[PDB]
Amino acid sequence: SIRYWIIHTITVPMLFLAGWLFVSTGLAYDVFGTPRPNEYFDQARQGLPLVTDRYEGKQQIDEFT
Amino acid sequence: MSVLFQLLIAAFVALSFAMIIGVPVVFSTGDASDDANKLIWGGAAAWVVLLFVAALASI
């Protein structure tokens, strides 16, 4: 009807912007470890950061990081 | 907890805006007072509690 319209108008764009800013402010890259477009390689670090050990994978990525 | 703090303040703004819209309608027209009065006073109480929590959550 009418009542819920106020709540949804106030809220839904706020959620949309929440996701928008979560991406734009670069937070997603930190949250998910996804490289920045310049972070795929350094100016010459064109080797691939592939995990080779099961037990210390997170630390090995930290070395790759 | 910095991101927690920012999310808390965002929720504070959300609640504050909700109270901004609700309060004149609830107060002016007491036709739905049974749930409206609970809504408005609970919103005020949540506002106070959230402010007090953020007071410490700053530091």
């Binding site: 009418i2 108008t9 | 004149p24 002016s28 027209t29 036709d31």
Partner: peptide, 23 residues
């Protein structure tokens, strides 16, 4: 950039008027 929040407030005011205006 800043027109979003200003528009939000412009919506906020007359909406508060209108919700009373319905009754």
């Amino acid at each position: 950039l800043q027109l979003t929040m200003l528009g939000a407030v412009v919506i906020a005011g007359p909406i508060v008027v209108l919700l009373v205006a319905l009754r």
